[PDB]
Design a protein around this ligand. Structure first.
Ligand SMILES: C[C@H]1Nc2c(cccc2C(=O)NCCCN2CCCc3ccccc32)NC1=O
Length: 116
């Protein structure tokens, strides 16, 4: 099995995360962990059992928490699935998530080809 070094993963994958941060306004709800009380959505953790956001993913890349590229992809997709689950289809967060998912799919594919 291929062993991926933490810096190899950071070099390959961090640009794909940056591409999501670069989306404005669409990344704005995703740049920090959800704070349900501050945001006035106290039911959030009743619906979303495994929160995830861009800042948490960035920290995981920085601190070598991913052994394999697919673990990174899984966390980005967790973030998207949380948003599509929690938010109504008409909402900004839902539509913004849909755009980030388009951007991410485009960015991640050539990078995954390069890592194999
Ligand atoms: C990921 C999580 N985000 C929110 C949600 C609902 C309300 C506010 C937020 C939220 O992130 N608020 C902080 C950003 C404030 N703000 C910044 C400008 C764009 C924008 C768009 C939609 C909702 C909020 C918003 N739903 C969620 O699933």
């Amino acid at each position: 099995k291929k062993i991926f070094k933490p810096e190899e993963l950071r070099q390959a994958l961090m640009p794909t995360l940056e591409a999501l941060y670069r989306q404005d306004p669409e990344s704005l709800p995703f740049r920090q962990p959800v704070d349900p009380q501050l945001l006035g959505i106290p039911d959030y953790f009743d619906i979303v059992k495994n929160p995830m956001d861009l800042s948490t993913i960035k920290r995981k890349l920085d601190t070598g928490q991913y052994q394999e590229p697919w673990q990174y992809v899984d966390d980005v997709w967790l973030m998207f699935n949380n948003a599509w689950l929690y938010n109504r289809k008409t909402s900004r967060v839902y539509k913004f998530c849909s755009k980030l998912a388009e951007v991410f799919e485009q960015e991640i594919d050539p990078v995954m080809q390069s890592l194999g």
